């Protein structure tokens, strides 16, 4: 469920789930899918930040 | 018409043609006409 | 096609001068009056609705009575609709008479068949009876098998069985008109017409002509 | 080939004891 939600949010911010997780890994961000998916719902801006960080790492 | 798995020139005036995905022999000799090559 | 709404009066014969008897059903077409014109703009199809006969005023609902009042026809025994295909123009109140079929050689008649109630497969579907003697046990008018073992393990839909017979819309086709009587508002139609005497019949020019 | 079987008892219901 989380992965599906994160994928939705990432793609709204112009990155695939698969690329976003790689990005975060490369950025050394170790936020779990449970939290990410919580952020994607409750703090859309923060999700976008994380996405921008992820994009930079890729 | 001869419907056969093996179609092939029976004489020198026979000519093989593919027409709508079927191999066919067509010839001046009506007996030589074939399909289902 | 335009048609009339008759009442089946009964059968009779018409002796021709050449000594042929003609079995005729007599349909009485009391003047039909257009009660509503349906158009493509209002209703999405072209039809006339017609009434026929009279209904006791007391027997007419307010909803019914307003519909007739709008046409400025008197209430009739029911309402029947005829699709128009020819771009034919009718107005409300316009009468249709037996004289419609003055040129028509053959008509198609439609009524409700007489009701035979619950009938078995033998009468309903012309099932053969089984043996009346020679051992038959309680299974003389029985319908037989109704299927075919494990495959398919069920009775197929539309299997001919006992059930209600009759009391159904039926149309006979290509019934000749023997005589139009405009005075008495009669059509004499060769042969049989669905349903019992007194039943409503719709008469229409034959579609297969 | 079809070998004619003996599937049922020789005395048939309702008498089958």
């Amino acid at each position: 469920l989380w992965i599906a939600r994160i994928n939705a949010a990432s793609r709204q911010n112009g990155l695939s789930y698969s690329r976003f997780i790689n990005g975060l890994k490369k950025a050394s961000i170790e936020i779990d899918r449970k939290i990410l998916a919580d952020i994607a719902v409750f703090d859309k801006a923060a999700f976008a930040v994380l996405v921008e960080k992820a994009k930079a790492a890729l | 018409m001869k419907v056969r798995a093996s179609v092939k020139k029976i004489c020198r005036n026979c000519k093989v043609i593919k027409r709508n995905g079927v191999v066919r022999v067509i010839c001046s000799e009506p007996k030589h006409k074939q399909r289902q090559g | 096609m335009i048609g009339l709404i008759g009442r089946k009066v009964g059968m009779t014969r018409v002796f021709t001068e050449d000594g042929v008897s003609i079995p005729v059903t007599v349909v009485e077409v009391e003047a039909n009056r257009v009660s509503q014109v349906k158009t493509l703009e209002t209703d999405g199809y072209a039809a006339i609705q017609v009434t026929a006969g009279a209904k006791k005023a007391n027997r007419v609902n307010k909803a019914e009575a307003g519909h007739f009042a709008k046409a400025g026809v008197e209430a009739g025994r029911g309402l029947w609709e005829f699709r128009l295909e020819n771009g034919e123009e009718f107005e409300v109140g316009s009468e249709l008479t037996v004289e419609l079929f003055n040129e028509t050689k053959k008509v198609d008649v439609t009524g409700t068949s007489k009701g035979k109630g619950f009938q078995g497969a033998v009468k309903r579907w012309n099932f053969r009876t089984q043996d009346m003697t020679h051992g038959n046990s309680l299974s003389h008018r029985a319908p037989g098998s109704i299927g075919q073992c494990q495959t398919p393990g069920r009775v197929f839909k539309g299997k001919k069985m006992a059930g209600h017979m009759g009391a159904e819309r039926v149309t006979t086709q290509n019934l000749e008109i023997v005589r139009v009587d405009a005075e008495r508002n009669l059509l004499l139609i060769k042969g049989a017409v669905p349903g019992a005497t007194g039943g409503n019949v719709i008469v229409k020019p034959a579609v297969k002509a | 080939r079809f070998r004619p079987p003996i599937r049922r008892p020789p005395i048939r219901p309702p008498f089958y004891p």
């Binding site: 919580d38 719902v41 | - | 197929f156 839909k157 | -």
Partner: protein, 142 residues
């Protein structure tokens, strides 16, 4: 603590309008199907219809590759013996334009109560017009 759940009461469903003209049936349908579920939203909850109303116009102009126009067959069984009915894509586009896309989407949606509910939100139209001006649908390139 608990993962968020979309609430049938609260879920915001947006109207969109898609032009089918010149679009690969299947590729179009897969996108529409995901939007009807609401897979495109972070609030995507499997047990809730948080999807979006999709209007499709020019459904009769939906495209198909290969010889699929003449060879794609739609089957229906009446449940009467020998009650199988076939129609080809081309013939179904003539008879009932809209069915082609609707069938496509229907297959791609989940089976059961909710999936039937999702499909209800698809409003397919053969022409270029639709009766849902009041819903103010946004154009969507899908």
């Amino acid at each position: 603590m608990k993962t968020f759940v979309a609430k049938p009461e609260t879920v915001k469903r947006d109207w969109y309008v898609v032009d089918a003209e010149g679009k690969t049936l299947g590729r179009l349908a897969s996108e529409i199907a995901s939007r009807l579920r609401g897979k495109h939203k972070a609030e995507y909850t499997p047990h809730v219809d948080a999807g979006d109303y999709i209007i499709v116009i020019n459904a009769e102009k939906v495209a198909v590759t290969g010889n699929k126009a003449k060879d794609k067959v739609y089957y229906r069984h009446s449940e009467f013996p020998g009650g199988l009915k076939s129609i080809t894509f081309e013939k179904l586009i003539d008879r009932k334009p809209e069915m082609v896309l609707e069938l496509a989407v229907k297959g791609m949606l989940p089976r059961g109560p909710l999936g039937r509910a999702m499909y209800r939100k698809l409003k397919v139209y053969a022409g270029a017009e639709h009766n849902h001006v009041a819903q103010q649908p946004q154009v969507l390139d899908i």
